[PDB]
Amino acid sequence: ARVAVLISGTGSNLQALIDSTREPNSSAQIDIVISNKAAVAGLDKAERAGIPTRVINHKLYKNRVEFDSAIDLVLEEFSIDIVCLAGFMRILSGPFVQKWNGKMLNIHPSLLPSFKGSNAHEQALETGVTVTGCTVHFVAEDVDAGQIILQEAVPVKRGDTVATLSERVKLAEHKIFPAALQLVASGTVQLGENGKICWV
Ligand SMILES: Nc1nc2[nH]c(CCCCc3cc(C(=O)N[C@@H](CCC(=O)O)C(=O)O)cs3)cc2c(=O)[nH]1
Ligand SMILES: NCC(=O)N[C@@H]1O[C@H](COP(=O)([O-])[O-])[C@@H](O)[C@H]1O
Secondary structure, eight states: OEEEEEESSOOHHHHHHHHHHTSTTOSOEEEEEEESSTTOHHHHHHHHTTOOEEEOOGGGSSSHHHHHHHHHHHHHHTTOSEEEESSOOOOOOHHHHHHTTTTEEEEESSOTTSSOSSOHHHHHHHHTOSEEEEEEEEOOSSTTOSOEEEEEEEEOOTTOOHHHHHHHHHHHHHHHHHHHHHHHHTTSEEEOTTSSEEEO
């Protein structure tokens, strides 16, 4: 399966996907990395790995639909089968999401359905949970509501900050994102016609 990884920043999840997809038994290959932001570290990681990069500045488009259309053009250019959102921080339009339904994965740094949104660690810390975690899910139009593929719990330690908690949770993200990608790319897991996860 041919994979695009979309990023907005550091790219530690991208690096874990690069590492995993290069193992001999990987059913996935990363053929393109797309960033909505220029000069971010994830682009360095991609180039260093010899993977093509494209920057699609969302700041240059009239609306969300036109921006997503620009992404989709690149996806078609590289004959992509599966899209991974790896620290990509844009909400995607309905039509784009529906086109890639069952073929697009996202990593989220909470145990969904808790703490949806862009500041999950802040929320977890404010709420006072002692267990948080991360989630890989299929992307549906409703943000962070798509079908869950894998999750891993991570303890919150007393005195944790966003800095220390995100660091601990990223270790788990780097485990379950590659595992989830391999499940989907191998055809082991798919989105069911009833819209529920199907383990083949
Ligand atoms: N339809 C849909 N789109 C998705 N994008 C992502 C990927 C995860 C998105 C995380 C989140 C970003 C924002 C947000 O408000 N983003 C801003 C951009 C602000 C910025 O540039 O930092 C926006 O898009 O207007 C809220 S949660 C997941 C996901 C999803 O499940 N469904
Ligand atoms: N709602 C999406 C979200 O919060 N994504 C989070 O951004 C970080 C990106 O790190 P990375 O650039 O090192 O992969 C990751 O922790 C990811 O879960």
